[PDB]
């Protein structure tokens, strides 16, 4: 176990940074999903001439 | 208040495994979006 050799201070640091990275990943995925749908919706509106 | 060593190791790993799965999902979704956009470009030309 590579984690079993890490000192406590570095494991704590890594956990803190890993949590913040996970939050940013989910927020970016959420924002990406929302923009993709609007562009696809607007693509559909574009081809449906009105 | 303190976090035990086993608990800290436990949470880190589950954060790590979840982080891995999040990145793989973004990667694959990213690949599919490009090659549908890409042939949309091919479609138009």
What does the secondary structure layout of this molecule look like, with pairings?
Two copies of one chain form a homodimer.
Chain A: H1 8-47
List keywords for this structure.
homodimer; 50 residues; mainly alpha; 0% strand; rod-shaped; protein binding
| Helix-and-strand structural type of chain A | mainly alpha
Number of strands of chain A: 0
Q: What kind of assembly state do the chains in view correspond to?
A: homodimer
Most extensive contact: A-B, 17 and 17 residues
Give the helix level of chain A as a range of percent. Answer: over 70%
| Major beta-sheet overview of chain A | none
How many structural units, i.e. domains of chain A?
1
Name the beta content range of chain A: under 5%
PDB class: protein binding
Keywords: structural protein, protein binding
Assembly: dimeric
Entry title: Structure of Rpgrip1l CC1
Written account of the structure:
- Chain B: It comes from Mus musculus (Mouse).
- Chain B: It is found in: Cytoplasm; Cytoplasm, Cytoskeleton, Cilium basal body; Cytoplasm, Cytoskeleton, Cilium axoneme; Cytoplasm, Cytoskeleton, Microtubule organizing center, Centrosome.
- 2 copies of one chain form a homodimer.
- By secondary structure, the first copy, chain A, is mostly helical.
- Chain A has one domain (about 1-45).
- Chain A is about 80% helix and about 0% strand.
- The first copy, chain A, is built from 1 helix and no strands.
- Chain A has one helix at about 10-45.
- Chain A starts with 7 loop residues before the first helix and ends with a helix.
- The interface of A and B includes residues 15 and 22 of A.
């Amino acid at each position: 176990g590579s984690v079993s050799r890490v000192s406590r201070e570095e494991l704590e640091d890594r956990f803190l940074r890993l949590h913040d990275e996970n939050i940013l990943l989910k927020q970016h995925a959420r924002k990406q999903e929302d923009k993709i749908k609007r562009m696809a919706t607007k693509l559909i509106r574009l081809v449906n001439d009105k």
